[PDB]
Write a protein that binds this DNA or RNA. Sequence first.
RNA 1: CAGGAUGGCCUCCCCGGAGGUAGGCGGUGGGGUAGAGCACUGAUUGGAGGUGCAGGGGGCGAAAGCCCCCGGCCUCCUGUC
RNA 2: CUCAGGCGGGUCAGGAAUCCGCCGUAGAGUGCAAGGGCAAAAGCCGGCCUGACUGGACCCGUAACAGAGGCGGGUCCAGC
RNA 3: CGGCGGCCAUAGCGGGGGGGCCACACCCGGUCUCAUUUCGAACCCGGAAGUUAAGCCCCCCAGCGAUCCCGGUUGUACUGCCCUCCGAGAGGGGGCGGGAAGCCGGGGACGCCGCCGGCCACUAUC
Lengths: 168, 186, 95, 197
Amino acid sequence: LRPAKIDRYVDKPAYTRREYIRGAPGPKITIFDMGNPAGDFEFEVSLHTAEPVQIRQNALEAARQQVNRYLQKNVGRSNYHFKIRVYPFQVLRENPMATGRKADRYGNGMRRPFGKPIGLAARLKKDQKILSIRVNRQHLKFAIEGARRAAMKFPCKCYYRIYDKEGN
Amino acid sequence: MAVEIPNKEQILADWEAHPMRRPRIEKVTINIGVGESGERLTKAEIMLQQLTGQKPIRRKAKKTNRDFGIRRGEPIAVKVTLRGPKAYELLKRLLAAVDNRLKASSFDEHGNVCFGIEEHINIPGVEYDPEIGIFGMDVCVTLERPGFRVARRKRKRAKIPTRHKLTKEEGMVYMMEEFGVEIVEG
Amino acid sequence: QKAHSFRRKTRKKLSKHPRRRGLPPLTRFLQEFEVGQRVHIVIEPSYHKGMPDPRFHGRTGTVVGKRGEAYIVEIKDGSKVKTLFIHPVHLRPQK
Amino acid sequence: MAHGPRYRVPFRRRREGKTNYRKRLKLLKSGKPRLVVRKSLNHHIAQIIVYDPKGDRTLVSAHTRELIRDFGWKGHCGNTPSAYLLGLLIGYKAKQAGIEEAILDIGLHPPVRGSSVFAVLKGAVDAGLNVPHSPEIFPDEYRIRGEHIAEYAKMLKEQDEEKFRRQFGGYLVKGLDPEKLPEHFEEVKARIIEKFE
RNA sequence: CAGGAUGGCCUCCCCGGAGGUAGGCGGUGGGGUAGAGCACUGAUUGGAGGUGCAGGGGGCGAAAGCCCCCGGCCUCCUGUC
RNA sequence: CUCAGGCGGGUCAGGAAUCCGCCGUAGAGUGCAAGGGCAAAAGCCGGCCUGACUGGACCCGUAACAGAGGCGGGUCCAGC
RNA sequence: CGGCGGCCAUAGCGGGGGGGCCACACCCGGUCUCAUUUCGAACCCGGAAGUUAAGCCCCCCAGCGAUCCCGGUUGUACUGCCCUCCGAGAGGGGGCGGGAAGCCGGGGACGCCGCCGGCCACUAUC
């Protein structure tokens, strides 16, 4: 695994379809709905994305868990509804490397500089909801703390910030 | 529940109201679906032709299976389409031979009816019978309104909406009047 | 050419809305097109047998005459003067 | 087409269920007028029609409603000798069209001999036109003269039933065919003249 | 293939000869890229309500028995693009 | 003469061929990649029939514009 | 009423009424010309006694669909053009010339038009 240095923005054309990539690895996030139903809470708090990007599968799970861990320990799962709205589709392309020598380059120039699928990534556009949580006013203050913690783990920056929708 | 009684009054009312609007029996097609041929030759065909009094028709095969219809282009089954007095006469002897009082939830959903009893062929001595003895049957009755004939030909084709259309209620009592008994349950 | 012989830059160019699909009114197949008349040539993909190279699409010529059922139209594809034989199906009147 | 924007264009004539486009496209190619012959149970129509992309124009009509009135013919109007003498009336108006070319549009119908469309065609040729056909499809003399029908009509009578002469069914109830008489046809066939007497 | 030839292209000369339309506007034609979306061909994330069914668990057992049930196989107002 | 497929009824072990009705604008099928085209058809069936014909053009692709052989098709007319 | 077209859903679905419908349907005979690898059902020869009830024609109602328009979102999304205009070399923004879909609200729209006949007619009933 490389660092996120091309997995942090939109810069390659949308090429999703598994009938031209012929399958790609599934998401590292294994759960997507958590907590209780959305009608048992009054208010809606979002983490809001302000910048178009592609965010890796690895970053979605880290971000999601780190929020969910704090939420679980303090609040318990008797309360809160937490959803991660987006789904990764965006297919990823890498030239293959094992850093050879002799007859091996890795490389290459050409002799197939072309992609390989290593994962999936989610395209987050302007004004989308990276996270959407439901809570009461009481259980506002845990969600905001989790949300700072997410915002770092985002590949860029937020500038609409921890946002009260308000849902009221 | 019950079914016969409202149906009967509607059809009787409609005839008085316009006596060349009443529903009719378009055909009775007597068929054996499962086949007597595919792997054998149907001598049930000889038995069927005497019983109808009309020529039967062979049935080409399609698909590939292992039971019947194993290759294509081979005869599989036999049917005869009866209309007019030739149907009514069939119905009276054949329905009487098998059972009566079958649910109107086990008949078609459009005023049409299929009977489903198997066994016994009328007309002795033919039902002993070499090579195929008494085989099974299915009898379908297609009921329709009188005005549809207009649609069938090449001139003034029209699919007639509910303003004269065949309603599920009437078709069942019209068939029953001719020869038939349907149970109340349905 | 290496990927041309009658098709290239087509699929979507020969594709239409489902409302413009179905074989078109009979009138246009029957339609006569006079000589001295200026015609737009528009590709109709509903009729295979007698259909322009996509490069030709949207060209405007003058009907130079007729061969058979088709008409022979002189058109200017670029600078070069060319004559194209096509059925009345693939002509529309200018005005 | 059906509901919402889906495959295939609607057409006034698909819904009407008339015409055969395939045949029609073929017919028109010659540039010759269409004699649009259409059949019904008790009417037969021929009209010399040209095509224009804007509406068709009809040069002359003739109906079986124009042969019942003013030519001393009673008959039935669905029968074959009504078609024959309909060919004759559109044979006197085709010499007033000034062109003798008259080709069959049968709409959507099969071609079999002993038909109305042949019967009229048959009357048209004798009326003096010249047309493109190859013969093998014309009725016999017994149909034209009105004699097959005469043998049937004496057999059957209406609102009666018997065993050979008044047996139930159509026989023709008219003032000058009460039992169907080829005498009647021979008078009316003598009336031939282009001044419409 | 570190090479020729033939065009496009450059120049000089000669011939025929009145329009030409790079420019801009309107009229008459062609069109699916930005964008946008659920209406198809389409890949799939997620919980409901159906319990319509192939079946891995239970019950009046006659271990999914007539009848309901639970991984679930696929409808349905919805759910990512 | 109009379809996969679905729905309910019959037949069968469900099912298929096969039957009966209702729904059904094309998802069917067209030998074979892919795409486009098409429902009184190019799809389905029955019958007949062997033009997958001879000759000589025309046009385009080939090779856009713009040179560039061979070759292919479409489109004509003449003859059968 | 009919027949032949054009635009080809602004003439789709649903429901309602009448017929100013011999002639157009249902309907009835099928011997004969003729359709069915089964049936006059289909195709065709023959007739109209009965039914207007379809169909078909005419009128009307928009709830669904499709056509077109107005306003809101929106001159927003997006864009052609230029910059020692800004950023660390990507690039962006402003001016200038243009400006879409999806959706919401509010509407026209359940045809129009051309030719020719015809019970009735000499006209438009339809």
